[PDB]
Symmetry: none
Subunit: 166 residues, 4 copies
């Protein structure tokens, strides 16, 4: 948009953090796994990544996005990461109810390290903006979408195509 | 202001509030993201149950027990945590309850900072209980020593009933 | 044996190495402070990328490009600088890349002095690239004329691919 | 003359300085590679915190603690290490610290040699603290016996505040 880059439920929202564009290298980040272990970029060294960023896996749109990317992306080939400001406890409980023990869900709630490094903090809400970044094994950002209106879905096919084409 | 969580040292951040003080105002969010403050419950006694996260077993049970055992004809039972509003909402729906107030301090830590229960290292609220009379005077306080232990239910429920 | 750095003249110190020479041995530190020498990579061709400091932007990009673009199936890509082992360890963690060897010449300048690439006024290594064959014959050399400029990536990568 | 680092013997090199002595001069580098000397801090008391490398955990914590605990309206807190200035500069930026002085001794070991805190086997500076008054008298010194241990923060802070 003209004042802020995106909206959430139609309300203008300011994105905070470093801007990252296609062609840039991936910044580092420090996030928490479902058991509170620190996880950083280097833990996925040597792999291509599809990073699906969601406002809250406890909402319907985010839930479906996590499911579809995990189902549609080849996990034999690279790594699908879901990152949000949900507490690790909500992510853990979501994976258990879904009966999905193959799905990686990481929490940026404590420092917003991921959000500030990738330019996807929704500042008025302290949630991460709906977004998708595809990284190759050299951590080149080959694809980025920040969804314009955060209650809409991301373009799934374009991100899957970018991940597959690596 | 020195507790442990899982035996690790945790520093508590924010204003110290003791028994006999008047309780400060704060702004948190309801399950639909509306702002709610202390003043929204003016004129009522409160049992304020603070938990690290209702998605854990100890916090879940503490929440259910205070809400089941405490009279709500007589006063208000608030549960405040740094869980996102969406998790507290799903949690009420899973429990099958329309009678439990859950409020989220995740955005600003307004409540945690005003009551001195921010666990700085974790960005979670410390397990605790404050009982406020209808004048917002703090008549009872407990900050649990080890944050993965239960608070003293009986003493807190007594302080609330006895107002 | 003279270059410029940000346009200022700099004197290179150490033994001059030319194409057609056999590369001298040297002792440097790995990210855990174990000693490493050139003999530790015996039998393989090498691209040795030399940078003033991987904590600057040009050195960071040079380091990423040689590591992604050179094949690591039948050769080795070494990055050598006067950065402390701790900065190179942090640097490789920050970037998150797989299989990137960085080695520190901070203690002795054993590599810098053996290859003629010590910027004497600064005690940093000059931006340079040496490509060695599997018998350690030097088949390509560039010491970048202005140290803040990029090296010629394609020339260095073509010499390495040709072995 | 002798300390341990991770339990192995380390020899200290340089001039021995004791409490009561006046402070030797030095030339070290700030984050932009400007030369800094004792004279740049004339008129002030100084807490000089010396660390093996701000890229390791204990040194990072030592640096933050001295900086937040010592009054900076009253005197100067210096951190000196053999890290390249580019690593010090990166460390301040990534930690978000506007107001922390880090100085690099990597080029000459000017500071290390003049203050007797060079760890000879490592070309790193020994973990140490010197406190100087405005006359540059050294009123307090500790060289930590095992270099992975923290200094005595309180004893250094008291000596600094007592000037």
């Amino acid at each position: 948009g003209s004042m802020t880059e995106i909206t959430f439920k139609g309300g203008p929202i300011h994105l905070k953090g470093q801007q990252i564009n296609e062609g840039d290298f991936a910044p580092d980040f420090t996030v928490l796994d479902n058991d509170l272990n620190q996880v950083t970029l280097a833990d996925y060294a040597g792999k291509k990544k599809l990073i699906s960023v969601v406002p809250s896996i406890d909402t319907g749109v985010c839930d479906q996005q996590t499911r579809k990317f995990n189902s549609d992306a080849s996990k034999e080939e690279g790594i699908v990461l879901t990152i949000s400001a949900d507490l690790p406890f909500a992510q853990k409980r979501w994976c258990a109810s879904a009966g999905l023990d193959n799905v990686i869900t990481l929490s940026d709630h404590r420092d917003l390290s991921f959000g500030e490094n990738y330019g996807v903090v929704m500042e008025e809400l302290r949630l991460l903006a709906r977004a998708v970044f595809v990284l190759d094994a050299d951590n080149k950002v080959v694809y980025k979408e920040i969804v314009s209106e955060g209650t809409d879905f991301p373009d799934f096919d374009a991100a899957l195509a970018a991940y597959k084409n690596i």
